[PDB]
Amino acid sequence: AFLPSAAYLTHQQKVLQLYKRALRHLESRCVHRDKYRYFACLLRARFDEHKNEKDMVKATQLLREAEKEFWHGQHPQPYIFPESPGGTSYERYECYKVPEWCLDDWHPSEKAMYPDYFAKREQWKKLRRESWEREVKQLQEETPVGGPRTEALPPARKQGDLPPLWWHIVTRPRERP
Amino acid sequence: GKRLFIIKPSGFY
Amino acid sequence: SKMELPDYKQWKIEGTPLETVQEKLAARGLRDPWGRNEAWRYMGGFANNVSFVGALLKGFKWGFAAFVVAVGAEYYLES
Amino acid sequence: RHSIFAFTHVLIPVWIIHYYLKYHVTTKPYTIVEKKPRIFPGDTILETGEVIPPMKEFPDQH
Amino acid sequence: MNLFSSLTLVTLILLTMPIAAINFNTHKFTNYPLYVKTTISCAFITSMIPTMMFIHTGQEMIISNWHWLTIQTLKLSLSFKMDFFSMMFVPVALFVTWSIMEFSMWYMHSD
Amino acid sequence: ITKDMLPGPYPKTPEERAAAAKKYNMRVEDYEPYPDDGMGYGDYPKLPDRSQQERDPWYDWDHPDLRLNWGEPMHWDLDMYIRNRVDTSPTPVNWNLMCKHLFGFVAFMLFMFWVGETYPTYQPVGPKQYPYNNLYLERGGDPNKEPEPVVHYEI
Amino acid sequence: GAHLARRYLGDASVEPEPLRMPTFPPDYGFPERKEREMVATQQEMNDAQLVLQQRDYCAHYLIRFLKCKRDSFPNFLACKHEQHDWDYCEHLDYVKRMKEFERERRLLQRKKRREQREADMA
Amino acid sequence: SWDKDVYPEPPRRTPAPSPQTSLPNPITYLTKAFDLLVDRPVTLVREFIERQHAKNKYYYYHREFRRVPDITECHEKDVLCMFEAEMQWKRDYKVDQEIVNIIQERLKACQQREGESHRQNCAKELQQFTQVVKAYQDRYHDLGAHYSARKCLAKQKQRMLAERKATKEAA
Amino acid sequence: AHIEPRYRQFPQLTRSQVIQAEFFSATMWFWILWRFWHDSDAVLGHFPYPDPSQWTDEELGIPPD
Amino acid sequence: DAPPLTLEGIKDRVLYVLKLYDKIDPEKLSVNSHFMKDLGLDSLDQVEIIMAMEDEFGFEIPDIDAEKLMCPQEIVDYIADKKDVYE
Amino acid sequence: MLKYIIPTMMLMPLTWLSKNSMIWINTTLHSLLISLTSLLLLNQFGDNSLNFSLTFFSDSLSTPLLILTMWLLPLMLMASQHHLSKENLARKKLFISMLILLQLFLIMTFTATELIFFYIMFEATLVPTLIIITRWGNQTERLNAGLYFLFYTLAGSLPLLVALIYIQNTMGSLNFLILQYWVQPMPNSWSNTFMWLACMMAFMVKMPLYGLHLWLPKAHVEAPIAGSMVLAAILLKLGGYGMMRITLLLNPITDFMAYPFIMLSLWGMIMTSSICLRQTDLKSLIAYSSVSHMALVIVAILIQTPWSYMGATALMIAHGLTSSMLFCLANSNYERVHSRTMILARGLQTLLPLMAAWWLLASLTNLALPPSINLIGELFVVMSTFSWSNITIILMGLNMVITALYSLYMLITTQRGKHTHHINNILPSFTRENALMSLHMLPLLLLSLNPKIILGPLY
Amino acid sequence: HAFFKAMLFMCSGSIIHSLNDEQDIRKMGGLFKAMPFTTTALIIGSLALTGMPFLTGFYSKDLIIESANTSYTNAWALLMTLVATSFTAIYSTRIIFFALLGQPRFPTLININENNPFLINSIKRLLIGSLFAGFIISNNIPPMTIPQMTMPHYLKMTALTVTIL
Ligand SMILES: CCCCCCCCCCCCCCCCCC(=O)OC[C@H](COP(=O)([O-])OC[C@H](O)COP(=O)([O-])OC[C@H](COC(=O)CCCCCCCCCCCCCCCCC)OC(=O)CCCCCCCCCCCCCCCCC)OC(=O)CCCCCCCCCCCCCCCCC
Ligand SMILES: CCCCCCCCCCCCCCCCCC(=O)OC[C@H](COP(=O)([O-])OCC[N+](C)(C)C)OC(=O)CCCCCCCCCCCCCCCCC
Ligand SMILES: CCCCCCCCCCCCCCCCCC(=O)OC[C@H](COP(=O)([O-])OCC[N+](C)(C)C)OC(=O)CCCCCCCCCCCCCCCCC
Ligand SMILES: CCCCCCCCCCCCCCCCCC(=O)OC[C@H](COP(=O)(O)OCCN)OC(=O)CCCCCCCCCCCCCCCCC
Ligand SMILES: *C(=O)CCCCCCCCCCCCC
């Protein structure tokens, strides 16, 4: 469907995602833990019944009518975790996730308020800008002709290189600023 | 005790 | 800083409705793998939680005692 | 300096608002219009002294 | 008349004072939420006096204190109606708001 | 930005269609323009009208709030299918069945309020009785006139 | 509430309509029926600023209760007897309205039996 | 103060305090505290300011406009006379506006002061209000935003023709 | 000392919250029983509802004709 | 409110939940026990392990990240990466 | 009025004899002195207008437009000095000369005692505006936009020239003070019908009227910031000023000629506001909002009741201030992202909090939050048009929904949400930009304290 | 209504803060003994909402039903008002059943705590309000109508019977 590394969902991955969503929507239907525990073992038994089906046509058909089963039998308001997309606290603190480059635009009277922090930040920016050309020439020597096929990125290969395209993963803001 | 730096834009101006 | 967890061996499902769930699963040839993970909810200080009329009648004993004392006080006060 | 909040936030605005109402708002017509107080049978007027006569004797019910 | 109308307007002006404080600031506060909570507790205490002297006589009035604009026959003035509804609703709103802000001094403390 | 990376006329030859699909950064078999009826779309792709809510939220998007990537051809109504606006996401109950349930519930409630208004409830009492000729001066009657004598009796 | 079934599931002929009644003269069936005595003078309840709903035939107990409630501030639990008097006299007025309703119902039963006796007569 | 005839008020009949209870109400204590702590310092500052007013007395005057010839006795397209008639008409229109404002203030003050017996006790102010609104409507309504003494005289002549025809057809 | 978080077991209760909660619960039931003892008519009824069939025709004025 | 996690605490709670799973013997389990090749667990069992991690720490692991956690060490590292511990 | 025309002309030596680094400070200082001097026009009487000479007078309609006009020049100088900093000094002085000359034409456009002099100044205001748009506009389409701006106005106004010269030949004069007293009622004929159209369609274009408004989302957008400020804040309001002057001479024919155009406005404010819900260009969204707000001024002038003229001139002053501030805010983000796409820069309250508060206040005054003079004008026009017909409230009220909808969407798209990742040149807000926002908003909020000075000649 | 409904939101938010921003009631429970002051005030608030006699919600809402029955009224409006009165009891005991009663359903790191004098005193003052405010206000206000107080025994006990059902 839509994945960064793989171009598709395999049949095994579709079965696992249906299993997880079936247990979660069942737990939404089955509020108490012992009653969900009983019915979740029954649902595990239903998934373990047709586990060893070798015909991929028959297995895909069973998966399709199991999806129909699930869509008929899902909770209307399922349980969502609070920081999960659709939850009550999802993307709540995005108004506090100030990016790092704003620290470059401070006045010197408030940069001097934190001397060790910015004196330590300058070597981060230094390490970033002397790692940049090495990781760019790493990317243009490893990518095949026609562009990269998948969105996966290589690691660092030498002792001294940093991994390519690392700065906005390492210097992303905390989830609770 | 493990005080964390709060990144915020320049409120000087 | 360091938080010492309780023991994983003590959360047994004997004495819980997890025991009843395992019995009604093993009656049909199934077995419950996650009982000891859920065993803490039905044990300890979270066992023997009150009913609904027990929740409504919280403080009914002391309130009724103060009521009887105040009714006796106003019965003695008129005479 | 222990009840400065009772001075700067209560009492100085009471002074300001009482001066403003008394010598600028009540001096203008119909600005503070007040409902006249409720006269009962059995009252006495302070400006006049005319005692309001009480009600008619009740046909006692109980 | 002099007590009722004065404490009536004192309630509203007292509530507007921390807005002037937060707009005219330079510093980091000595617990500005405590200041607003103390202000609203004081506003409840202040607004109870006109409510009690409304419970006594039924004393209602209108403070049309500031002429604002006359559109040829429509004289819009800053006019406050102190009747049964304001006298009962202002102390209830101040008492509830004082409880909500002492709740908020704990709940929104990490903000 | 340059001229042949801007939208142009409607493609009519297949090589112009392939150049359009190369321009909008999408496959030629996936590229479908709007039908040439003269509505001013030109070569702009007819994306399948999905809201941005339906996108995978766990994906590392370039624009996480829009759930949209860099270079990705936007929908014509991308300002309309943001998560602050029209959502096309699937609902557990069918749309036509939702419309049936909502319209039937609202129509039944309106009809039953009309039934209750046509046949209202009341108490087994008479009218409320007021003195002084049904309170003639209190209701705003003029004292120079005189109303008909409304007299109530004991029972 | 049984009159709802007697007027809707029953007939509207013998049941009195609520909005237009009494449909009979007050002397029709009453030898020497006395009027209702209003105790509070109209100027007295004018000066007591009562609500126009509250200016019924039993407003004098309400005037006494409001005079008590003003004269007993802040002891707001010390005029229960005047309030009980006013509530009892409002109950008596409600009983009089019930008597008027039952009178209208029995007169419509009388007219129904009258027209049935006239229909069986000739 | 003001003039009590243009802004009429009935005299205050307040009832005497007749407390029945033994608990003292807080209104008397807070009224005494308001008299001691608030009303007396405000009175002292006002007396200081009043002395500073009295140390230099000077007066402002109400501008009197004498009557000039109105639009009926100004020649057609003679701007020197009909300009003055128009200025007189506009000042009279603004003064009649404020007359309606005064009667509205009387009506609202009567309603609030009478309280719940307002529907009986303010029939006189309602009658005065209906009279002055009917007069302002027959005098100035529907003239438009480009109103003038010409427009108002044309409305008056149309109303007088209607009144004359209604009298003539009924006689 | 302040309340320390626990793991898979019942949390540390202060004595103060328990005595406050029990005091206000007893205050609720005291007030309900007090106002039900003294008033007893705001719930059950103030005045008896008369039966309109039990009224004789002499007081309602029905001449038998 | 919201006590900060550590790597040792996340490790203890992850191995604590996995010791409470009847298809895992708590005398064989280490931080590097691969579920399919050392503990011999099914893919359905691995999904249930990730869901118990979700119910344990109170946040959802997505499926594309659920399917790639094959030992307790990678789970502890994933919760470390999503909770920013040892700040 | 010659105490204002001569200082505005002395602003030309004040900008052409200045030192090369002092040509913004001197013009700002002395234009603020002229704007402080502008308050002497508030000598207004309840009966007579402030009549200066045979050439100039100023009633209570022209006075607030004059004070807004003389106030707008220092604000345009503060707005336009950043993006013209790399400009040549001679073209910089020419830009300041075009702004000064446009103010000069405007202040004797609003004080024209005679209507053909009003026409000469009213069409004189085209040429500095046209040169500013087609010379210091940023994009390619400034030339086409200047063409549309020139040729809608001239095609509407060259019949206005023939109509005004016909009034000069028929009535004898085009003095407004004479025509207050020599106005004849205009009867029903086809000749008087096209008399009405020739007197009205120029101002219909300048307001703009819906359907004729096509110049404005090109002229306001392709202009620089000073051009957009003067086009939105003043140059639309020439049409309302001229209609309020010229409907004196068009009675009682307006009472049945206004019926289509009122429809074009009462539907137009529903359409253009709806267009604001789907505008990707933020500056075009503000342009269509200006069309939507001036539709109410057209309706209020065409129903010609006193409440409608009071509300229409209050709406003109209020929309001048509010729309000028909204264009300046859009410029404050254009000088950081160098694009006008509204969905591009997002989450700007996380980075620029005080500038987000200025956006908040400008959006609340855009949606007519009481007691702003925006709401005073909006509300009084709605009162008068309820008196006109009781069904118009629907077209009013639904508009007041949609006017809220894009006023906050503009606040939610730009200032709220997650910030754009790749945009990192978002500087902190300058003192100049916040000064510009405050000098727009603080007079607008002070006019809520004493709004009678912006309610026109029939307060 | 201001008192007990503000207190119900405050108690719900105290539960939400103690359970790390958990607002879904299917991950609550076992909070009877865990948050005893929040439990007490939430039960008092729900009883004031449903019109427990002589709590604050009795002093208006019950009288409302005693006027909604005894009046010339849309009867379908009356029947839907009584069904709403039953549904108030249903969702109030839904709150108490899923939030307080039963066993825990929230995750395993218990950080249940409510011992701030801000939280305790702020719920305390609205708790005293939800106990006594209907009595105090309904005795202090002057009468503005005539209260209908004569009605049959099924019609007086209507709101309480429907609430108990
Ligand atoms: C003639 C003498 C007059 C004297 C009195 C003046 C009266 C007021 C005039 C206008 C005041 C505007 C200035 C403040 C806002 C703009 C700047 C700003 O945001 O600063 C933030 C800053 C404090 O915040 P911060 O934390 O530092 O930074 C902001 C954060 O980044 C994050 O920002 P934020 O969003 O958190 O904070 C912004 C916040 C955001 O809040 C809102 O947006 C909510 C407001 C709307 C809803 C609530 C109000 C609804 C209407 C009710 C009020 C009016 C009627 C009341 C009357 C009784 C009933 C009729 O707004 C406020 O806090 C402002 C409170 C007052 C609002 C007034 C209404 C504006 C709303 C829009 C128009 C509404 C209609 C017109 C009303 C006109 C009133 C005069 O304030 C200052 O630094 C203030 C500086 C000094 C200001 C002087 C203002 C007057 C200047 C005039 C000079 C010439 C005359 C001399 C008088 C001088 C007096 C001192
Ligand atoms: C912290 C500093 C506080 C102030 C310090 C200085 C004063 C110290 C205390 C002593 C008092 C000073 C003397 C008294 C004050 C002056 C009295 C006086 O006559 O003042 C002249 C007048 C009184 O009204 P007026 O009727 O005399 O004049 C109005 C003007 N005409 C008639 C032309 C229309 O003005 C004031 O008092 C101004 C202040 C009013 C207070 C309320 C302002 C509210 C603003 C809201 C804006 C938007 C409202 C929109 C809606 C309105 C309703 C529809
Ligand atoms: C922006 C684009 C739209 C612009 C619209 C402009 C207005 C639309 C109508 C304009 C009509 C032309 C000017 C009329 C001036 C009337 C003055 C007058 O005295 O009239 C009475 C006179 C009457 O003559 P008279 O007054 O000498 O007669 C004596 C009086 N009676 C009648 C009793 C004998 O009207 C005319 O002579 C002719 C009027 C109509 C003219 C028709 C030709 C022009 C066609 C329309 C052109 C519109 C603009 C074209 C450009 C569009 C864009 C490219
Ligand atoms: C006394 C009588 C009482 C009568 C009552 C009934 C009469 C009114 C009939 C109903 C009218 C209002 C309801 C219809 C419009 C509702 C629009 C709305 O609120 O949309 C919300 C929607 C997002 O909602 P949601 O998806 O729930 O958000 C969570 C995110 N997952 O947000 C969006 O999609 C954003 C949309 C932005 C643009 C809005 C476009 C629609 C505007 C509609 C205006 C209608 C005006 C009608 C005026 C009638 C006047 C007579
Ligand atoms: C006759 O029934 C008069 C009473 C009012 C109309 C019917 C109201 C029905 C609901 C109240 C009684 C409910 C008993 C469970």
DSSP string of A50-118, one letter each residue:
TSS---HHHHHHHHHHHHHHHHHT--SS----TTSTTSTTTTGGGGS---GGGGGG--HHHHTTSHHHH
Neighbours of chain J (3+ CB pairs under 8 A): A, B, C, F, L
Residue type, position F55, single letter: R
Q: Do residues L128 and I29 touch, judged by C-beta distance below 8 A?
A: no
Q: How many residues does chain I have?
A: 65
Tokens standing for D20?
A: 């403003």
Residues 6+ apart with CB under 8 A from K145: K133, K134, K137, K215, K218, K219, K221, K222, K223
Question: Which residues does residue E82 pair with via DSSP β-bridges, in sequence order?
Answer: E61
Q: Do residues K444 and K321 touch, judged by C-beta distance below 8 A?
A: yes
Tokens standing for K407?
A: 């006023």
CB atoms within 10 A of CB L143: 15
Q: Is D40 left (phi over 0), alpha (psi -120 to 50) or beta?
A: beta
Chain centroid to Cα K201, Å, comes to: 18
Residue in F63, F79, F84 closest to K280 by CB? F79
Q: Which of E42, E36, E34, E58 is nearest to E7 (CA)?
A: E42
Dihedral sign for Cα atoms in the order F92, F96, F102, F105: negative
Q: Do residues K205 and K212 touch, judged by C-beta distance below 8 A?
A: yes
Tokens standing for K118?
A: 């009003």
Could you tell me the CA-to-CA distances from H45 to D15, E10, E13, H33, J82 in Å, in that order?
10, 19, 21, 18, 67
CB atoms within 10 A of CB E35: 17
Tokens standing for F67?
A: 């759930």
Residue K396 CB-density burial (10 A; 0-12 exposed, 13-18 middle, 19+ buried) = buried
Question: Which residues does residue K114 pair with via DSSP β-bridges, in sequence order?
Answer: K175
Residue K440 CB-density burial (10 A; 0-12 exposed, 13-18 middle, 19+ buried) = buried
Q: Kind and range of the H or E element at J49?
A: helix J43-57
Residue type, position K219, single letter: A
Long-range (24+ apart) CB contacts under 8 A made by A150-155 are A150/A4, A150/A5, A150/A6, A150/A7, A151/A4, A151/A5, A152/A4, A152/A5
Q: Kind and range of the H or E element at K51?
A: strand K50-51
On the CB side of K382, CA atoms within 13 Å amount to: 16
Pairing of strands E74-82, I6-7: unpaired
Resolution in A: 2.8
Could you tell me the CA-to-CA distances from A57 to A7, A11, A54, A70, L155 in Å, in that order?
21, 11, 9, 20, 68
Q: Which of A14, G48, L24 is nearest to J43 (CA)?
A: A14
Dihedral sign for Cα atoms in the order A131, A136, A139, A141: negative
Closest residue CA from atom 32 of ligand 2: E67
Tokens standing for K424?
A: 């990192």
Residue in A94, A102, A168 closest to K351 by CB? A102
Could you tell me the CA-to-CA distances from J74 to J39, J52, J78 in Å, in that order?
15, 15, 6
Q: Do residues G58 and G93 touch, judged by C-beta distance below 8 A?
A: yes
Residue E29 CB-density burial (10 A; 0-12 exposed, 13-18 middle, 19+ buried) = exposed
Q: Kind and range of the H or E element at F150?
A: none
Looking at chain D, which residue has its C-alpha nearest residue H47? D23
Q: Do residues B13 and K435 touch, judged by C-beta distance below 8 A?
A: no
Residues 6+ apart with CB under 8 A from K46: H90, H91, H94
Rounded to whole angstroms, how far apart are CA atoms F57 and F66?
Answer: 10
Parent domain of K42? 1-459
Tokens standing for H49?
A: 């300011």
Q: Kind and range of the H or E element at E94?
A: helix E84-107
Percentage helix, strand, coil for chain H under 3-state DSSP, each rounded to 5: 65, 0, 35
Residue type, position F14, single letter: P
SS3 for E82? strand
Rounded to whole angstroms, how far apart are CA atoms K58 and K62?
Answer: 6
Dihedral sign for Cα atoms in the order H82, H86, H87, H88: positive
Residue in B4, B7, B13 closest to A98 by CB? B7
Tell me which chain A residues have a C-beta less than 8 angstroms from the C-beta of C30.
Answer: 41-42, 45
Q: Which of G19, G16, L78 is nearest to F117 (CA)?
A: L78
Tell me which chain L residues have a C-beta less than 8 angstroms from the C-beta of G18.
Answer: 72
How close, in Å, is residue F91 to chain I by CA atoms? 37
Residues 6+ apart with CB under 8 A from I58: none
Rounded to whole angstroms, how far apart are CA atoms H82 and H71?
Answer: 6
In chain A, which residues are followed by a C-to-N distance beyond 2.5 Å, i.e. a gap? Answer: none
**Residue keyed to tokens 């209609």:** K243
Q: Which of L67, L69, L81, L162 to mutate to test the pocket of ligand 5 (most atoms within 8 A of CB)?
A: L69
Q: Which of A161, A168, A155 is nearest to A133 (CA)?
A: A161
Residues 6+ apart with CB under 8 A from F101: F93
How many angstroms is it from A86 CA to the middle of ligand 1? 36
Pick among E73, E77, E82 to test the H interface (most H CBs inside 10 A): E73
Q: How many residues does chain K have?
A: 459
Q: Do residues J51 and A21 touch, judged by C-beta distance below 8 A?
A: no
Residue type, position K133, single letter: I
Q: Kind and range of the H or E element at F84?
A: none
CB atoms within 10 A of CB C75: 9
Rounded to whole angstroms, how far apart are CA atoms E108 and C53?
Answer: 35
List, chain by chain if needed, residues with CB within 6 Å of any ligand 3 atom.
Answer: K 152, 155-156, 159, 162-163, 166, 191, 194-195, 197-198, 201, 205
Characterize A123-132 residue by residue with b for buried, 16 or more Cβ atoms within 10 angstroms of its Cβ, and e for exposed.
eeeeeeeebe
**Stretch 66-95 of chain L: residues touching chain F, C-beta under 8 Å:** 70-79
K370 lines ligand 2 (CB under 6 A): no
CB atoms within 10 A of CB K85: 9
Tokens standing for A35?
A: 């009653």
DSSP letter at B10? -
Tokens standing for F57?
A: 């939220």
K421–F78 C-beta distance less than 8 A: no
Q: Which of K438, K316, K319 is nearest to K65 (CA)?
A: K316
Residue type, position K99, single letter: L
Tokens standing for J76?
A: 């502890």
Rounded to whole angstroms, how far apart are CA atoms I62 and G103?
Answer: 8
Rounded to whole angstroms, how far apart are CA atoms J25 and J38?
Answer: 11
Residue type, position L89, single letter: A
Could you tell me the CA-to-CA distances from K321 to G45, K226, K232, K362 in Å, in that order?
57, 13, 9, 9
Q: Do residues J2 and A176 touch, judged by C-beta distance below 8 A?
A: yes
List, chain by chain if needed, residues with CB within 6 Å of any ligand 1 atom.
Answer: E 19, 23, 78; K 353-354, 357, 360-361, 364-365, 369-372, 442, 445-446, 448-449
Q: Kind and range of the H or E element at F18?
A: helix F14-23
SS3 for K8? helix
Tell me which chain G residues have a C-beta less than 8 angstroms from the C-beta of D50.
Answer: none
Alpha-helix residue ranges (DSSP H) falling in K38-141: 62-80, 89-107, 115-124, 126-136
Q: How many residues does chain E have?
A: 111
Residue type, position K204, single letter: M
Which ligand lies nearest to the CA atom of residue K408 in the structure? 4
Characterize C10-38 residue by residue with b for buried, 16 or more Cβ atoms within 10 angstroms of its Cβ, and e for exposed.
ebebeebbbbebbeebeeeebebbbbbbb
Tell me which chain F residues have a C-beta less than 8 angstroms from the C-beta of I52.
Answer: 124
Number of domains present in the structure of chain K: 1
Rounded to whole angstroms, how far apart are CA atoms H118 and H112?
Answer: 8
Pairing of strands I6-7, K57-58: unpaired
Q: Which of F125, G5, F129, G106 is nearest to L151 (CA)?
A: F125
Rounded to whole angstroms, how far apart are CA atoms K272 and K293?
Answer: 9
Residues 6+ apart with CB under 8 A from L130: L3, L4, L7, L41, L44, L45, L48, L55, L56
Residue K344 has φ and ψ, to the nearest 5°, of -70, -65
Tokens standing for E9?
A: 């307007």
Q: What is the 3-state secondary structure (H, E, C) of D32-59?
A: EEECCCCCCCCCEECCCCCECCCCCCCC
Q: Is G33 left (phi over 0), alpha (psi -120 to 50) or beta?
A: beta
**Residue keyed to tokens 């829009």:** F66
For the CA atoms of H159, H164, H165, H171, what is the dihedral angle to 10 degrees? Answer: 150
**Residue keyed to tokens 């909006």:** K378
Could you tell me the CA-to-CA distances from J42 to D16, J23, J35, J36 in Å, in that order?
80, 10, 8, 6
Tell me which chain F residues have a C-beta less than 8 angstroms from the C-beta of J62.
Answer: 58
CB atoms within 10 A of CB F94: 10
Could you tell me the CA-to-CA distances from K94 to C54, K97, K288 in Å, in that order?
87, 5, 30
Rounded to whole angstroms, how far apart are CA atoms K15 and K83?
Answer: 18
Could you tell me the CA-to-CA distances from D57 to D38, F130, K355 in Å, in that order?
21, 20, 76
Q: Treating both helix axes as pointing N-terminal to C-terminal, what angle do A56-72 and A11-29 enclose, rounded to 10 degrees?
A: 20
Looking at chain F, which residue has its C-alpha nearest residue J65? F58
Rounded to whole angstroms, how far apart are CA atoms A84 and L106?
Answer: 16
Angle among Cα F104, F110, F113 to the nearest 5 degrees reads 135
DSSP letter at K112? B
Could you tell me the CA-to-CA distances from E52 to E45, E97, G74, H28, J35 in Å, in that order?
11, 20, 8, 11, 74
Rounded to whole angstroms, how far apart are CA atoms B7 and A162?
Answer: 25
Is cis: bond before E18, omega within 30 of 0? Answer: no
Tokens standing for H35?
A: 């008299």
Rounded to whole angstroms, how far apart are CA atoms L95 and L114?
Answer: 19
For the CA atoms of G48, G50, G52, G55, what is the dihedral angle to 10 degrees? Answer: -70
C5–J22 C-beta distance less than 8 A: no
How close, in Å, is residue K455 to chain H by CA atoms? 13
On the CB side of H3, CA atoms within 13 Å amount to: 3
How close, in Å, is residue E86 to chain L by CA atoms? 13
Tell me which chain H residues have a C-beta less than 8 angstroms from the C-beta of E72.
Answer: 97
Q: Do residues D41 and D57 touch, judged by C-beta distance below 8 A?
A: no
Helices (runs of H) and strands (runs of E) counted in chain B: 0, 0
Rounded to whole angstroms, how far apart are CA atoms A26 and E29?
Answer: 51
Tokens standing for D37?
A: 């107080």
Residue type, position K294, single letter: M
Characterize A62-88 residue by residue with b for buried, 16 or more Cβ atoms within 10 angstroms of its Cβ, and e for exposed.
ebeebeeeeeeebeeebbbbbbbeebe
I16–L34 C-beta distance less than 8 A: no
DSSP letter at K454? G
Q: Do residues K271 and K211 touch, judged by C-beta distance below 8 A?
A: no
Q: Which of K109, K142, K145 is nearest to K124 (CA)?
A: K109
Pairing of strands K50-51, E74-82: unpaired
DSSP letter at H122? T
Chain centroid to Cα J33, Å, comes to: 11
Residue in C41, C45, C52 closest to L97 by CB? C52
Q: Which of L43, L16, L17, L45 is nearest to L32 (CA)?
A: L43
Neighbours of chain D (3+ CB pairs under 8 A): E, G, H
List, chain by chain if needed, residues with CB within 6 Å of any ligand 4 atom.
Answer: F 85-87; K 277, 394, 397-398, 401, 405
Question: Which residues does residue F121 pair with via DSSP β-bridges, in sequence order?
Answer: L73
Q: Which of K184, F130, F114, C75 is nearest to L77 (CA)?
A: F114
Q: Do residues C24 and C49 touch, judged by C-beta distance below 8 A?
A: no
Question: Which residues does residue E29 pair with via DSSP β-bridges, in sequence order?
Answer: none
**Residue keyed to tokens 């699930």:** A70
Pairing of strands D32-34, E61-71: antiparallel
Instruction: Give chain L's radius of gyration (CA, Å).
Output: 18
Residues 6+ apart with CB under 8 A from L67: L147, L148
Tokens standing for J13?
A: 């709670």
For the CA atoms of A158, A164, A167, A173, what is the dihedral angle to 10 degrees? Answer: -100
Q: Do residues K332 and K448 touch, judged by C-beta distance below 8 A?
A: no
